[PDB]
Structure 1
Amino acid sequence: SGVEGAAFQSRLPHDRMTSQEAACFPDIISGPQQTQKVFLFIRNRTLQLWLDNPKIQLTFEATLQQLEAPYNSDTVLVHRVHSYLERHGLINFGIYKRIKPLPTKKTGKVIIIGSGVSGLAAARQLQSFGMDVTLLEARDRVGGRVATFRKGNYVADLGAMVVTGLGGNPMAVVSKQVNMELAKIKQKCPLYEANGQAVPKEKDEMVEQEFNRLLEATSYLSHQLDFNVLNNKPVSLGQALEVVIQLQEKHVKDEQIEHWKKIVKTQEELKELLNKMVNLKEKIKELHQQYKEADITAEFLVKSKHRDLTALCKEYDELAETQGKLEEKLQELEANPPSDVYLSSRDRQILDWHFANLEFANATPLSTLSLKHWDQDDDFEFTGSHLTVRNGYSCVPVALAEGLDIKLNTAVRQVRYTASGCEVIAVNTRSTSQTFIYKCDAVLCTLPLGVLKQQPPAVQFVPPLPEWKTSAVQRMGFGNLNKVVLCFDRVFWDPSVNLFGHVGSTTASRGELFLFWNLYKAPILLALVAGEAAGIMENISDDVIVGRCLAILKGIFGSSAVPQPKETVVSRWRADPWARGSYSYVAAGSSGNDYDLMAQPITPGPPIPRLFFAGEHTIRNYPATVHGALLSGLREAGRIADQFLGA
């Protein structure tokens, strides 16, 4: 349906109130059921009005005007609902034409550290709410881990790059607002072995299905058998994977042993049977000789010796009957061995390609992921096909930057917060002698987890953060992932495929240049560096790693088909001091609960909160994504406005 779709698109149950709404509307949950049903229709229709046209502000007045009778009659309730939705960023979020110009007199000073999607999203909210917002950003550009390279006619994303499904995705709104050109990804992804030979279809399918089987087995191990702690240590996904492969190898070795035992036993029966047939041939040779040597007892001696000869001959024909039914069992046993090994060497390399794919998705070696919780956010996937941004994902944060007070090249070094307000201290990255002091009522920290983990610290907190926050920082994973961008003057790959895989020769390096990505109709190739390779490869110069790319591609398509690239780019997210990695992951011994701890604001001791946190690492249900960063910015804007302007 139409207004039900709007609730789904807002990640809300269309037919019941959330706990959050129950808190804000206690008179509804405790009141008659009929009024609760009225509430839900107001909410859904208001969201639809916004979502049908997110390019302009949806005001209370326009909501009231577009509600049909009787709903346009309960003005107070309509306003309450509109107000709630607006405060939580469910309407009037992103970038839109304001009908009511911004209030000229402000209320509260908020410093936002970082101009990534989370910082920008919060800034636009807080500015809409009438506050004085200033973003301090260390880079010379906005977007943070959204980073688009442009040179000549080439455009390519170095950070985030995919919109996952649009159904339920707040980025769907931003797409309409900003005019992102989205393009569906074709799912076919051919694999090539390290010699450049294509992986045959059967091997591709066999290994992939086994990969799915192994992984489902780890999840059974974890969530049915409660095999989550071992020798006082939390189990990692990599560990469980090694265990389930070891058991398959054991099983293969068993069926091989059973089969060899059947072989040996049949050989032993043949040896025995032949020895017995031998002695019966000798016995018949003796009777056949005493049969030609032949009175009345003699005329009866021949009858008896023929009865004896042909009875031994019946014994012998029956034993050669068993001889045949046995060496017929032997022949098909030698012709039907069970698998010699679990995984051929080539099979293993291909399986390591799928593991690399998973290390790409989580940005970290599998041996670091929590077995129990690494995919705790699975249940929140959006519906619809994934897409890429043909005009470059930076268009989103660049559009969000319009009109904001943003100080670039301004690196926060220290954050002071007391019960009387806050001070943020920063240096000019082009002249680190120049120092700045920003007084404010509240600080929103969107510093990446990688920056928070940095030892010695990049940013100093005064007073230091509480143990519950720092130890959550300590526990959480922050992974890495890098790209080689290859710009050519001609397209030599299969234009109808967006993806193809290079199977690494060894397990340790399975993530090196394992995936080649294709951007729609454009002579660009992205090669991914995942897993253990991602951090190590940062120590390789651009020219050498490009050379390794070209060697792979020449192996796949032919040495003369691959020209020299016109432009190249290489991400080094770990070494980037403003990222110190790519995005969080649930490390073994962490859990979704640590993301909630990350989101919790700090209050100086006996009082009201001063220091707030947003960023992809603060949102339990959508971590490590652009939309999660966005949603987290909206969440904190709501929390801060609730604090400083009232619920």
Structure 2
Amino acid sequence: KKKVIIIGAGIAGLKAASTLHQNGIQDCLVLEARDRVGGRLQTVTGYQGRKYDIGASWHHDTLTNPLFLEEAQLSLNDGRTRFVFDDDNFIYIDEERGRVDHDKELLLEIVDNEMSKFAELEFHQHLGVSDCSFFQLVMKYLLQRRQFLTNDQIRYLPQLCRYLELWHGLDWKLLSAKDTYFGHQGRNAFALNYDSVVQRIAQSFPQNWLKLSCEVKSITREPSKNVTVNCEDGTVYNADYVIITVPQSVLNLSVQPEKNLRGRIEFQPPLKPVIQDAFDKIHFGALGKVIFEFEECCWSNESSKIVTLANSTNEFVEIVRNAENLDELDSMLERTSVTCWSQPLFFVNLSKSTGVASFMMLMQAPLTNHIESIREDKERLFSFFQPVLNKIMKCLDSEDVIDGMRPIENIANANKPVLRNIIVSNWTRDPYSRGAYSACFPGDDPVDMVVAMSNGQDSRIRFAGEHTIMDGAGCAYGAWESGRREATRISDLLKL
């Protein structure tokens, strides 16, 4: 039947089909479980046709990102704007204090810088079976350096640096301090429609290759040198090769009993031991998103980066100043319910960088699942997030946010910000994502997963996806790369 069958039509599978096509391979299929292409790339339409990337949103590592360069070379030719560089001076807001960023007395970014360097030291060339929760690492720093920090620095620095949760979508007690501090190949570029990247790659191979709304339920290497793919609807396929691009979290279901779990793939012979073992040394984070769409911007556009700090206390300073050592420090902090001030929140002020009166808010586990479980209660959401939204507005030279999500406009706003809609992501609940992207807990190492994935179940069952490659690991451009990788190798093999 089919020369190559690609499972999943995310950026991996799409690039893999595109490469297959580019090398002259025909009779390939792309089988996608969702009713759209793009996977964790998803541009959503909200109020008055504004568009948002509820999935991946930036090109990272833009000095070296081979996908981004590709995009830049297009913009160099047709002049149009595919991305904007929106790195900015973060505006940091504590509920009580207001703006703590760029402070003459607080100097929070400076000691943040010291803690990052402290972290790079505490790990690189020493090992010692280190690794601890990003939280544990920050406590260590606070112990070693308390003599050289003010009380406010001890209060507010540990909250400010929790902006790092939104890089992985994990709370700092779940984040590997090791993974917390990784370099970045340069500025970030906010994609002005990642769906246009998807569109570009998807229309670059025959559309009759793409079969939509077709979950795959099993894959079997009849040792007679072909691969049986069995879709859920019952259609079965005879494939020379298979490129499986299902998310890491999805593939993980393959190595547990009970196969009803939607998205799982039954492997016969099952995933070989060097594959199953890697799931122990790498996990999945829950970065989530919330879009607040306002009628029009009536707040300062000083910056597109605004992070609200979780509440901090005078007695956290005291406990720090008292502990003899880290065990005493960890133990003393034994001292509820969740609000919007209970964790850091990352707000992209789109009005400055794309001219659209909306905020793009990032959130993390454990908050992400809870907020995603109530994504349709738009009134709950307005209640939960109203406090930080007003603190933002007030620090941004505006006023409290009016709930204008159902009709009846009073006409007297003009300088009051009016919320018209909220969009929420769903990746934790969507059975075909089951989290955000690869992310490690303390004591993980992607290296095992990469190796296992990159070299295949056998020569016929291959793997692509953001979890399957070292450079750009967890990023859309790694996924992309991993695609071109598998397809290039198969292209050379078919091309006889």
Change (3 A) 1:505 1:371: closer
Q: How does 1:382-531 map to 2 (within 5 A)?
A: 382-383=185-186, 385-390=187-192, 392-402=193-203, 403-404=206-207, 405-419=209-223, 420-427=225-232, 434-454=233-253, 458-505=264-311, 512=343, 514-519=345-350, 520-531=354-365
Contact 2:138 2:158 in 1 (8 A): no
Q: Select the structure with the greater relative contact order (CA < 8 A; seq sep ≥ 6).
A: 2
1-structure distance, mates of 2:386, 2:175:
32
Q: Percent identity?
A: 26
Pick the aligned partner of 2:384 from 545, 548, 552. Answer: 548
Cα distance change on mapping 1:601 and 1:117 into 2, 3 Å: same
Cα contact 1:598–1:618 (8 A) shared by 2: yes
Distance 1:368 1:203, change over 3 A: farther
**Counterpart Cα distance in 2 of 1:549 and 1:191:** 17
Partner of 2:55: 159
SS of structure 1 residue aligned to 2:234: strand
Given that 2:101 and 2:108 are in contact with CA atoms closer than 8 Å, whether structure 1 keeps it comes out as no
Normalised by the length of structure 2, the TM-score is 0.79
Q: Which amino acid aligns with 2:103?
A: E
| Equivalent position to 1:149, from 44, 55, 71 | 44
Instruction: Find the counterpart in structure 2 of residue 208 from structure 1.
Output: 109
What is the rounded CA distance, in whole Å, between the counterparts of 1:221 and 1:200 in structure 2? 26
Query: Within 5 A, what are the aligned runs for 1:567-606?
Result: 567-594=421-448, 595-603=450-458
Once residues 364 and 401 of structure 1 are traced to their aligned partners in structure 2, the CA distance between those partners, rounded to angstroms, is 32
Q: Secondary structure at the match of 1:615?
A: coil
Q: Does 1:248 align with 2:142?
A: no
Go from structure 1 to structure 2 and tell me whether the alpha carbon gap of 1:196 and 1:247 turns closer, same or farther (over 3 Å shift). Answer: closer
Separation in 2 of the partners of 1:488 and 1:211? 33
Question: Would the aligned equivalents of 1:193 and 1:504 in 2 still touch at CA under 8 Å?
Answer: yes
Distance 2:347 2:58 in 1: 15
Unaligned residue ranges in structure 2 (runs of 5+): 314-337, 402-414
Give the Cα separation in 2 of the matches to 1:496 and 1:245: 31
Instruction: Determine helix, strand or coil for the equivalent of 1:548.
Output: helix
Change in Cα spacing, 1:177 to 1:436, as seen in structure 2 (3 Å) is farther
Q: What amino acid sits opposite 1:118 in the alignment?
A: A
Deviation track 1:228-276 (CA, whole Å, cap 9, x = no partner) reads 25xxxx5444333332223334x47xxxxxxxxxxxxxxxxxxxxxxxx
1:645 corresponds to 2:491: no
TM-fit CA distance, 1:437: 1.2
Contact 1:415–1:424 (8 Å) recurs in 2: yes
Aligned to 1:558: 399
Return the alpha-carbon distance in structure 2 between the equivalents of residues 156 and 460 of structure 1.
35
Deviation at 1:192, TM superposition (A): 1.6
Which digits, 9 at most, give the CA deviation of each residue in 1:456-509, with x for residues without a partner?
552221211011101112321211111111122111232342111211215997
Report the CA distance shift for 1:395/1:513 in structure 2 as closer, same or farther (over 3 A).
Answer: farther
Which structure has the bigger radius of gyration?
Answer: 1
**2:294, 2:357 within 8 Å by CA — same for their partners in 1?**
yes
SS in 1 for 2:235: strand
Shift of 1:407: 1.0
After TM superposition, the score normalised by the length of structure 1 is 0.61
- For structure 1, list consecutive stretches of 5 or more residues without a partner in the other structure: 1-106, 253-338, 428-433, 604-608
Return closer, same or farther for 1:599/1:644 CA change in 2, 3 Å cut-off: same
Tell me by how many angstroms 1:584 deviates: 0.6
Over the aligned positions, Cα root-mean-square deviation in angstroms equals 2.8
Aligned twin of 1:225: 126
* 1:360 maps onto 2:162 in alignment: no
Q: Is the 8 A contact 1:236 1:369 kept in 2?
A: yes
Instruction: Report if aligned partners of 1:350, 1:503 keep a CA contact under 8 Å in 2.
Output: no
Give the CA deviation at 1:371: 4.3
Q: Flag the structure with higher helix content.
A: 1
Task: Report the secondary structure of 2:215's partner residue.
Answer: strand
- Secondary structure of 1:126's counterpart equals helix
Q: Distance in 1 between matches of 2:129 and 2:7?
A: 38
